[PDB]
Amino acid sequence: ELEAMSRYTSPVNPAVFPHLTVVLLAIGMFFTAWFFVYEVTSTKYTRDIYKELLISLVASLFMGFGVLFLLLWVGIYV
Template identity: 50%
Template structure:
């Protein structure tokens, strides 16, 4: 196996777009987290909807998770 004949690895996301992706994904995740928190604070036990709460929490965690990964890549911690 000759290393000089191998293809060079190209990252699927360009380094120049990491700051924008980080800010966008973390911003959406924080917005959903804030709306989930307001939903929990303002609702009573009679008008809660479990499916809505789970979907909102899961969506928020996905956006914050991907935003955190791009944040780590942006600062140079390669995961």
């Protein structure tokens, strides 16, 4: 029917979209910077593939979520 259906409230209170956008970006950006610094300073004999993979994956995850929340914060509501 239509009477026994609950209203569809958002999973994340919209007032939390700004607070969540900055943080998730900042952390992300930080890690990103680290990665790039690591790729300029370290020579061929001082590079670890597992460390690079780990830091790059963390940066990618945090950055994806931050970019989503920002894109939704401006009002595109993807």
